[PDB]
């Protein structure tokens, strides 16, 4: 497709604003935003995580004003994690730091990820352990082999459904995603402190080196996120993933395209 | 409101300078700056923190010289935490690092936050545990549901009162706050070290991408802050939040609007 | 060689895109991407690591479109580690963080390295302990002496074979590698947390101060990588290196040279 | 009113010096160290001895006699003797059985300022009931509000070995004629991270291009470099401090009224 | 001396490339790159480290092409050589935990390099002035208690290899006009080595007037310390481990008056 001129004027511009809720597993009616407590398999062969123990990628497909050639072009993003201060609840059934101490805060491995695209985020499967049996209700790499532990090119998918694609199975496919801008950080380690910044003064530019942002096919914008903040440790010592919602504000402009 | 030209001349500028004290809970007459010692509930459902155990957002509404259309526009900010060196008192009823050692310093989860606006900071409620029973004298998310643990759009508030809005319940609402600039960092983790920088040489510009700063409605400037530095651990092992004051210096100019 | 003008026009550019799989040791048919469990010799004298306990440098030689004097010049690189989220599998035969806790994540010493060159990466040998007996099937510093522990200029090699050059024996030779650009970070320490960033928005420019990138001799591009992410600790406490694949995308252009 | 800069060869001068730390110096052998830290039983009974309390360092440096005033334009600065912290073999508590001595580590405060007059201080107390010892200058008439902000506690850094670090900070409402920079890194296990180089310069000019102006032809340099604590074999801990190098370039500036 | 124009032309430029080996103590014929295991004295007064327990500064003086013209050092590429050797976690190390891999090299590090047209000038500072430094080392003489903070008598030149202990000496900031130095001490018993390698990074050696070190007598002085941390053996005893440093220096001919 040939990318031509940007439309100017009052109605040449639109704005998308929303939040994506985390999908941590939600083990019961009181635990939205948490996973089930983590259990450990005896062997690699017997790894069989339940669905409510697996955080999943979040995704929203957002319909844009009909243009039917013109396409909406995503230009700028403002984003942040919503509710960062909730992690200061150090008094709610947590394991004490020491005798008489406060509760341990959420900490340990985190994955913070967001993307803005003109089509679904394209995924590549990579498995820590190829013999893991993934549960019904999840979408996971099929026909896994030992090579799936490093790179098996069969594991291609689209992030096209909520509560479905487990975080541990899937990453953005760097061989694809031409029409998406993605950003992520895994911070591993059992004792890693959450470091969460909030401000309404920071913008991310979504244009590539040619001045072109994601172009929204069929007038749909795709927003994806993961914000696993770390693990909450309850009084018994059991640990659950804790996630938070992510705010998105995307500025878009009309762009003429040919063919 | 349409934003027009900035007024010039000697009388077209003003300066606001002040300290905002922390509101950590102040459990007795000797413990200003501290919270009550932290207790842990045995279940999520029984979480019922006492008021003096909950740090709150600080806020000051500052009257500006009367203009009564001209509005005061906040342009720059100098800010820092005041009393950073007090955290070196490692000899005062603290739990020793090890046998014969010095007292443990203030450490662990911190939240450092400041905002400057031409109206009250707008808040969105998010709850770690939606069944937490928040105490009388605090203002908290009402009609909480399990969805409040991730996002419930009913929980909207204004930071319009001191010693009232618990830090753990509320964040700046990213869907609002057009007329405020806010900045915050949460550093979690039980053993996290305070890293506190001071200088009189650093300035934050409050103008947006169109060159407009917060515009002060009714000639009032709103300053908000949280500076939970971490926890102090006493000899028994009990832990209390410790907070410090924040200095604000704001430069403002007169701006015509229509 | 005298470097002259760059060729222009649509056909003057080409792109290489591939992944390099990690070579961590692969101790059995199920453990691709892992090393063998780490054992410790009683003395420096008795240090004799298994082949499957030693991570190696990865390399790929990529043939480019035939030119002939013109040479392909590597200008830009996009690169990232593939499968960062796999390290969130904290439920598979791991040692618990504490009683009832989740499994320990991959952590500890890491080496992340990549290079792009117009010829094989040039290596210099440096040994932690010169008395280490390196195993059959590996290529290692020969005629080692006590000076090999700091600098022995005899230890020169080319990274010209996979599953061969152990990471711990070899580094890029800074006295050579004129025609390669290399980047690496060793983060040492038992409890170091992996910090892995992913994005499709970041480019590294490969041109030197004179504006000249690697020039591909015989129309071959050389890509090299190491991504030792840390160690996985199983239920017994034994530890194995865990590695991940690395994506490369290289933009090249035709450059005229003389002699 | 601040007018033009004087040019020519003698319109420029340089000040170079070392500021020694004032950590408490508990005996004739322990310069640079505090007394071992003792912990009070309660807040009420907190009564630190003088030699256990690090203080701010200050030097007033006379400039060439000169309305013209010397204007401080640039600063080069670093901690001197960073490598001494590698003495891990001198009466230290072992890291573990048969291990080396523990290095200096834990809470640090690194601070420096350059001004045309004494650094202005604001008092803030961790515990308002702390009894500060004779020989120190501390916040007077302390109340519970002193634990957060009591504006009565104003002072000038005008004496060495006198103003305890834990009691005092630069007063942000004042210090118009000073540039100050500091970092507190708290936490019992914090590692010292100390950079040295003769290639780094700090510009002291404000946004209007004016540096500190030296009243009475005197330049004020202040510092704190508490590097952390040294743990001896018994487990007792003392603050260890190091000297700070200052190189300040000054130029002659004409001023009115 | 007044600094004039840079000479141009093909032969007006030269390059120096070399490696400086670390001098960690080398306690026996198998332990080049290591110090002797660290022993701890009972008291400050009894501190008496053996020579092979003390890492020293490394120095090389490199002769340049014979030339008033002076060679001027303009740029530096440098890195630590053999960073991957620290991945040997299988050779007589102390296990991190039961059944685990050996502990890697970690704890206090000092990484330092300088480039000058004359010997690096040193200032002495002692952790403990009563330390008895061993024969074969060059150390601050006539030490007093003031040597623990600043004794201006302690002046030296880094003019000998395996001689000047790292812990005794630092670059003298009141001198070194004709040298550019850079160093980082990262203390702490468990500090992780973070070691970056690349052939794409250059340090410019010119001062604010655009003048680099000028090589007196046509000699270039390179100095380094790369104590990477401590290696812990099975018994728990710890030894410093160091690595070599690569230097590549570009120089140009500069005319100088008198």
XYZ file of C-alpha atoms in Angstrom, chain C:
259
model
C 40.088 -1.345 0.435
C 38.982 2.145 -0.621
C 35.328 2.868 0.246
C 33.418 4.875 -2.383
C 29.765 5.873 -2.970
C 26.594 4.067 -1.903
C 24.341 2.835 -4.742
C 20.788 4.198 -4.860
C 17.507 3.084 -6.434
C 14.921 0.548 -5.232
C 17.151 -2.485 -5.940
C 20.115 -1.031 -4.003
C 18.823 -2.273 -0.612
C 18.199 -5.691 0.957
C 17.030 -7.075 4.289
C 18.018 -10.106 6.378
C 15.667 -11.454 9.008
C 16.316 -14.510 11.172
C 16.532 -15.977 14.648
C 19.532 -17.590 16.342
C 18.661 -20.386 18.762
C 20.618 -20.652 22.048
C 23.188 -23.394 22.586
C 23.127 -23.966 26.327
C 24.192 -27.623 26.309
C 20.909 -29.528 25.775
C 21.572 -32.360 28.297
C 18.691 -34.588 27.077
C 15.957 -34.857 24.403
C 13.607 -32.763 26.591
C 15.961 -29.987 27.666
C 16.660 -27.842 24.599
C 17.546 -24.357 25.863
C 18.859 -25.658 29.188
C 22.341 -26.686 30.270
C 23.119 -29.771 32.330
C 22.900 -29.226 36.107
C 25.938 -27.327 37.395
C 28.401 -29.300 39.528
C 31.473 -27.885 41.286
C 35.000 -29.353 41.231
C 36.845 -29.910 44.525
C 39.857 -27.873 43.290
C 40.986 -25.692 40.367
C 43.123 -28.681 39.230
C 40.098 -31.010 38.971
C 37.804 -28.608 37.047
C 36.515 -30.694 34.119
C 33.115 -29.479 32.886
C 30.881 -31.661 30.710
C 30.191 -30.473 27.181
C 26.469 -30.300 28.014
C 27.096 -28.055 31.051
C 28.795 -25.345 28.937
C 26.821 -22.689 27.023
C 28.348 -21.802 23.635
C 28.304 -18.813 21.279
C 25.663 -18.997 18.539
C 26.516 -18.007 14.976
C 24.810 -17.842 11.608
C 26.448 -17.123 8.247
C 23.786 -15.697 5.933
C 24.408 -15.641 2.152
C 23.300 -12.386 0.523
C 22.264 -11.630 -3.083
C 25.259 -12.079 -5.400
C 26.955 -8.809 -6.345
C 30.015 -9.405 -8.541
C 33.291 -4.022 -7.149
C 30.165 -3.819 -4.978
C 29.758 -4.995 -1.371
C 26.708 -5.244 0.872
C 27.062 -2.797 3.773
C 25.128 -3.460 6.997
C 23.501 -0.191 8.113
C 20.948 -0.890 10.837
C 19.957 -3.638 13.242
C 16.767 -4.414 15.103
C 17.154 -7.162 17.669
C 15.447 -8.723 20.665
C 15.291 -11.778 22.889
C 12.413 -14.087 21.867
C 10.201 -15.668 24.530
C 10.872 -13.432 27.546
C 7.491 -14.370 29.066
C 8.441 -18.074 29.284
C 10.372 -17.098 32.434
C 6.981 -16.573 34.081
C 6.527 -20.353 34.259
C 7.037 -20.516 37.999
C 5.044 -23.736 38.432
C 7.209 -26.386 36.756
C 9.559 -28.457 38.988
C 11.030 -25.325 40.598
C 12.340 -24.868 44.132
C 9.806 -22.940 46.222
C 10.793 -19.425 47.338
C 9.663 -20.360 50.885
C 7.211 -22.854 52.456
C 4.025 -22.943 50.289
C 5.483 -20.307 47.915
C 5.749 -20.183 44.127
C 8.744 -21.644 42.255
C 11.897 -19.537 42.023
C 12.212 -17.792 38.654
C 15.256 -17.943 36.384
C 17.829 -15.556 37.903
C 21.566 -15.189 38.539
C 24.436 -14.420 36.210
C 23.480 -13.494 32.673
C 25.351 -12.758 29.468
C 23.498 -11.031 26.638
C 25.555 -10.474 23.512
C 25.034 -9.846 19.810
C 27.180 -8.908 16.840
C 26.801 -8.126 13.150
C 29.818 -8.423 10.837
C 30.982 -8.796 7.237
C 33.100 -11.769 8.375
C 33.293 -14.156 11.358
C 33.493 -12.620 14.850
C 37.095 -12.638 16.033
C 37.672 -14.156 19.465
C 40.227 -13.820 22.244
C 40.496 -16.545 24.899
C 40.478 -15.690 28.611
C 40.196 -18.435 31.238
C 38.880 -18.080 34.778
C 41.114 -21.013 35.738
C 43.835 -22.053 33.263
C 43.769 -25.637 34.594
C 40.164 -26.203 33.511
C 39.924 -29.271 31.268
C 37.516 -28.399 28.457
C 35.661 -31.355 26.902
C 35.933 -33.115 23.538
C 33.637 -31.496 20.988
C 34.396 -27.958 22.167
C 36.908 -25.502 20.703
C 38.875 -23.835 23.513
C 42.157 -21.997 24.258
C 45.031 -24.422 23.608
C 48.460 -24.482 25.307
C 46.933 -22.669 28.297
C 49.304 -21.206 30.903
C 48.788 -19.217 34.117
C 48.930 -16.049 31.967
C 45.777 -17.269 30.162
C 43.933 -16.204 33.339
C 44.616 -12.541 32.437
C 45.906 -12.273 28.827
C 47.639 -14.772 26.570
C 47.760 -13.479 22.980
C 48.112 -17.015 21.572
C 44.382 -17.588 22.184
C 42.927 -16.298 18.885
C 39.940 -17.859 17.116
C 37.102 -17.198 14.682
C 33.502 -17.883 15.670
C 33.044 -20.232 12.696
C 31.079 -23.182 14.131
C 27.990 -23.756 16.276
C 27.839 -25.729 19.553
C 31.618 -25.368 19.720
C 32.900 -22.173 21.360
C 32.112 -22.095 25.095
C 30.965 -18.694 26.352
C 33.203 -18.794 29.461
C 36.439 -19.239 27.391
C 36.025 -16.610 24.759
C 35.271 -12.927 24.291
C 35.275 -10.644 21.248
C 38.889 -9.701 20.484
C 39.019 -5.885 20.825
C 42.360 -5.781 18.936
C 40.574 -7.059 15.828
C 36.914 -7.016 14.621
C 37.342 -3.918 12.405
C 34.546 -5.242 10.165
C 32.105 -6.224 12.947
C 30.021 -4.302 15.491
C 29.559 -6.135 18.788
C 27.619 -5.407 21.995
C 27.542 -7.417 25.217
C 26.694 -7.185 28.907
C 27.691 -9.556 31.678
C 25.529 -9.145 34.773
C 27.132 -11.322 37.451
C 25.753 -12.335 40.836
C 23.769 -15.252 42.266
C 20.455 -13.380 42.686
C 20.588 -10.895 39.787
C 17.127 -10.340 38.265
C 16.668 -10.704 34.499
C 15.576 -7.375 33.014
C 14.453 -8.047 29.458
C 13.060 -5.292 27.256
C 11.136 -5.974 24.049
C 9.977 -3.494 21.359
C 9.789 -3.199 17.573
C 10.529 0.546 17.738
C 14.284 0.451 18.525
C 17.074 0.531 15.917
C 20.852 0.366 16.302
C 22.882 2.115 13.591
C 25.915 0.024 12.555
C 27.909 2.744 10.784
C 31.264 3.773 12.260
C 32.442 7.388 12.753
C 33.255 7.604 9.017
C 29.695 6.490 8.165
C 30.718 2.988 7.036
C 29.045 -0.203 8.281
C 30.298 -3.819 8.162
C 31.167 -4.808 4.581
C 30.162 -8.344 3.650
C 33.105 -10.254 2.151
C 32.000 -12.867 -0.397
C 28.393 -11.656 0.077
C 28.106 -13.253 3.541
C 26.622 -11.656 6.665
C 27.701 -12.968 10.077
C 25.320 -12.815 13.030
C 26.437 -13.934 16.491
C 24.652 -14.122 19.826
C 24.649 -15.271 23.427
C 21.565 -14.963 25.620
C 22.215 -16.778 28.885
C 19.274 -15.450 30.919
C 20.290 -16.830 34.316
C 19.826 -20.151 36.075
C 16.722 -22.240 36.649
C 16.634 -23.916 40.078
C 14.754 -27.241 40.265
C 13.087 -28.736 43.389
C 16.342 -30.315 44.625
C 18.213 -26.998 44.486
C 20.347 -27.921 41.477
C 20.708 -25.205 38.849
C 20.985 -25.148 35.052
C 21.602 -22.273 32.670
C 18.513 -21.211 30.697
C 18.891 -19.464 27.341
C 16.546 -17.845 24.824
C 16.626 -17.220 21.048
C 17.524 -13.853 19.518
C 15.825 -12.111 16.595
C 17.912 -10.151 14.075
C 16.728 -7.769 11.365
C 19.515 -6.141 9.357
C 19.150 -3.517 6.619
C 21.905 -3.536 4.015
C 22.825 -1.308 1.064
C 25.155 -1.654 -1.932
C 28.484 0.098 -1.552
C 31.171 0.510 -4.218
C 34.739 -0.277 -3.130
C 38.096 -0.415 -4.935
C 41.022 -2.886 -4.685
